[PDB]
Design a binder for this molecule. Structure first.
Ligand SMILES: CC(C)(COP(=O)(O)OP(=O)(O)OC[C@H]1O[C@@H](n2cnc3c(N)ncnc32)[C@H](O)[C@@H]1OP(=O)(O)O)[C@@H](O)C(=O)NCCC(=O)NCCS
Ligand SMILES: [Mg+2]
Length: 228
């Protein structure tokens, strides 16, 4: 497992953005072109180029070579490289990607004024009440702490928001109370949170507990490199 990060200490220059657009598919350039805000385009663009750069290098291929596809619920993958699993998350000045030989999920969030939504429908009565329990100055960070962890799980599973697969078992406790057991004990996942910037919350969800101690930082200059 390896985690790479790109911190946009400065936006991409006119030329840098044109150079990177050159590595992606026509469909991706259109999607990038369509964003109202250039910083959303820059995040999607860099996330795409980071994956191309990391995986192509792993298989001595050219970034341009990679061909992406989308699984059933939209999770990206590279069909011709089945064991090169990855996941991207980007928020604010951060674009981060996790790579593993098994399904992986990652999430980074710029911390900002919370909104009851997601917090009401995406947070349990439990997570929600816990949150409102935090003091006002700790609510924003706590919200994103829980959310980054929760979304890393959902992004790792890939199956969207509705565990349909035979991924759960009904367990009965005292007086017949049910507890749903998930994930299946034989399909465990683990989460590790990383402190990369105080204005952000980040979490990785992997199929094994072997998380790298550090994230490898990549610059625009390293991503633009040819490296045959
Ligand atoms: C899970 C989801 C809500 C994440 O949103 P987010 O919190 O805004 O954004 P993050 O920065 O954490 O992550 C975005 C990336 O996650 C990845 N991603 C997309 N769908 C994903 C999914 N179902 N599971 C895991 N990762 C996914 C992508 O690489 C995307 O990067 P990009 O948008 O620049 O191409 C969203 O990715 C999703 O569910 N997409 C499904 C889309 C689909 O199947 N069809 C679109 C039909 S209109
Ligand atoms: Mg997110």
């Amino acid at each position: 497992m390896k985690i790479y990060g790109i911190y946009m200490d400065r936006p991409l220059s006119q030329e840098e953005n044109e150079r990177f657009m050159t590595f992606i598919s026509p469909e991706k350039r259109e999607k990038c072109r369509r964003f109202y805000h250039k910083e959303d385009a820059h995040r999607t663009l860099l996330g795409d180029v980071l994956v191309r750069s990391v995986i192509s290098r792993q298989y001595q291929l050219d970034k341009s070579d990679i061909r992406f596809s989308t699984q059933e619920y939209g999770k990206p993958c590279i069909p011709d490289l089945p064991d090169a699993h990855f996941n991207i998350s980007h928020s604010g000045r951060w674009v981060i990607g996790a790579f593993d030989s098994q399904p992986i999920g990652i999430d980074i969030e710029k911390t900002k004024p919370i909104s009851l939504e997601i917090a009401k429908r995406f947070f349990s009565k439990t997570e929600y009440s816990d949150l409102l329990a935090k003091d006002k100055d700790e609510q924003t960070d706590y919200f994103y702490h829980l959310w980054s962890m929760k979304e890393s799980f959902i992004k790792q599973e890939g199956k969207g928001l509705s565990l349909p697969l035979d991924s759960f078992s009904v367990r009965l406790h005292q007086d017949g109370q049910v507890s749903i057991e998930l994930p299946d004990s034989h399909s465990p996942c683990y989460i590790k949170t990383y402190e990369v910037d105080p204005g952000y919350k980040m979490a990785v969800c992997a199929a094994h507990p072997d998380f790298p101690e550090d994230i490898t930082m990549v610059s625009y200059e390293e991503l633009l490199r040819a490296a045959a």
